[PDB]
């Protein structure tokens, strides 16, 4: 955090690669950032630096082209702490789409949890989520559901 | 179903074909060719679905259904499908026409309920209904309609003005012409006319490009006279169009979009066709 004429944004990108691709460091470091997360998201606030912000974002953008759930569940959970959270409901919402791998139980379930934290907004530009350049309503998302 | 339907219309493009049944849907299917596939079903009347009509381009294609209920319920391509954008309910039973009107008199609707009503329906931003309400007839009104007098809409030699005609069929067997004033924000009873001892079912406006106006008042008398306007504020004349009574039980009366001829649409499900010949009389046609 204490960087930026101490450390170099690149010199930290590789760090930041190192240790979540080695499984020994990657689950206790990366909780532990996000536990800190919670501690000023409860603020209104962030714990980190823009830089930081970016270099996780990009690292995990990564890791979804490896497939799998659980690598749109740490960007959600970083998203959600860290105040993206118009792209945190994208993420879910990704997941959906990208995977066929989901039944169609699981399709609706998925659906459910964008819908509601659409809805809990109580900003009128957070009721809807971006898919390319057209704009995707609740409205939308419920027909998927029915549908899905 | 489709084992009764009681309207159906298209739109300017040729896309949607609805189709409106009696049990309460607006089936919409797809124009391809004389080949139809359906895309949708709205379901919300508690009423039979009386008829249907569509809006010009211009402001959008708007599809406003109606049924026996008090109920106008417009709807509107939207959200992959077919979506309301407004509602419109200040009757209470028997809504049996709904028009929309052309844009050199706004975005207008033009309501006809069974209970000696008609609003128009003006139209704003947010796509909010403002029913102006008038009482006409008594018994009821079946339909609606109106044009200039002095001028006309606004163009290169037809003025602009502030004025707006009205045929209203009624169920107290009359069929009388309102006029509108938008200089005084009056709606003046100018004439009655009376043709029928039975219920005038359908008027309409003929969108001749003749100055002369005629009006197509169908009845359960079997006859149709034809109300003929010299000019856009000329008198009326009753006129025969078959000089005897039709076999045709007569509902509807409907002029072509080109051309001046004149289809009833018969119970029989033949439609007669009617219009003036070398002589200067309404002689047969089909």
Redesign the interface.
């Given at each position: 955090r204490l960087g930026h004429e101490c450390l170099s944004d690149t010199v930290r990108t590789n760090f930041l690669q190192l240790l979540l691709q080695e499984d020994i460091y990657s689950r206790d470091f990366f909780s532990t950032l996000l536990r800190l997360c919670n501690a000023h998201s409860d603020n209104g606030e962030l714990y980190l630096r823009t830089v930081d912000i970016k270099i996780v974002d990009s690292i995990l953008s990564q890791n979804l082209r490896s497939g799998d759930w659980e690598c749109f569940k740490k960007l959600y959970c970083f998203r959600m702490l860290n105040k993206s959270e118009r792209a945190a409901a994208e993420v879910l919402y990704q997941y959906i789409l990208m995977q066929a791998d989901l039944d169609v139980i699981r399709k609706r379930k998925c659906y459910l949890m964008v819908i509601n934290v659409l809805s809990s907004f109580d900003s009128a530009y957070d009721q809807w989520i971006l898919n390319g350049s057209k704009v995707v309503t609740l409205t939308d998302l419920r027909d998927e559901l029915r549908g899905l | 179903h489709n084992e009764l339907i009681h309207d159906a219309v298209l739109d300017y493009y040729g896309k949607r074909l609805a189709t409106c049944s009696s049990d309460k849907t607006i089936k919409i299917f797809e124009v391809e060719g004389e080949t139809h596939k359906l895309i949708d079903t709205l379901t919300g009347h508690e009423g039979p679905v009386w008829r249907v009509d569509w809006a010009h381009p211009k402001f959008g294609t708007i599809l406003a259904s109606c049924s026996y209920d008090g109920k106008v319920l417009i709807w509107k391509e939207e959200?992959?499908?077919w979506?309301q954008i407004a509602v419109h309910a200040v009757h209470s039973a028997s809504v049996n026409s709904v028009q929309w009107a052309p844009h050199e008199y706004g975005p207008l609707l033009l309501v006809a309920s069974s209970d000696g009503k008609v609003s128009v329906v003006e139209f704003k931003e947010n796509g909010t209904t403002s029913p102006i309400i008038i009482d006409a007839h008594a018994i009821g009104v079946n339909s609606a309609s109106w044009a200039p007098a002095t001028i006309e809409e606004d163009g290169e030699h037809n003025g602009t003005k502030e004025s707006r005609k009205f045929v209203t069929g009624g169920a107290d067997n009359l069929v009388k012409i309102w006029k509108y004033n938008s200089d005084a924000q009056t709606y003046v009873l100018e004439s009655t006319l009376e043709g029928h001892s039975d219920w005038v079912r359908d008027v309409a406006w003929s969108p001749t490009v003749l100055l002369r106006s005629y009006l197509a008042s169908v009845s359960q008398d079997r006859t149709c006279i034809i109300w003929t306007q010299d000019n856009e504020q000329g008198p009326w004349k009753k006129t025969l169009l078959k000089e005897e009574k039709f076999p045709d039980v007569l509902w509807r009366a409907s002029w072509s979009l080109s051309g001046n001829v004149l289809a009833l649409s018969g119970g029989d499900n033949k439609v007669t066709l009617w219009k003036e010949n070398l002589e200067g009389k309404w002689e047969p046609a089909g």
């Open positions: - | 959200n992959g499908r979506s």
